[PDB]
Amino acid sequence: QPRSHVDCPALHGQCQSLPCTYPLVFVGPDPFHCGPYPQFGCCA
Incomplete structure (x- = not known):
């Protein structure tokens, strides 16, 4: 599955404008799982 x-x-991270500034790191293009907008990157 996608999840x-x-x-x-499951991790409950935060969507920020890539690149994902450490310690957080990019996990995948998750539009639905975002804060402000899906365009952002689901940083975990």
Whole structure:
């Protein structure tokens, strides 16, 4: 499944404008799992 590859919701990270500034790191293009907008990157 998609969630298995990306634990965006399971981890509950934050969507920010890439690149993902450490310690956080990019996990995958998760539009639904975003704060301001889906365009952002689901940083975990």
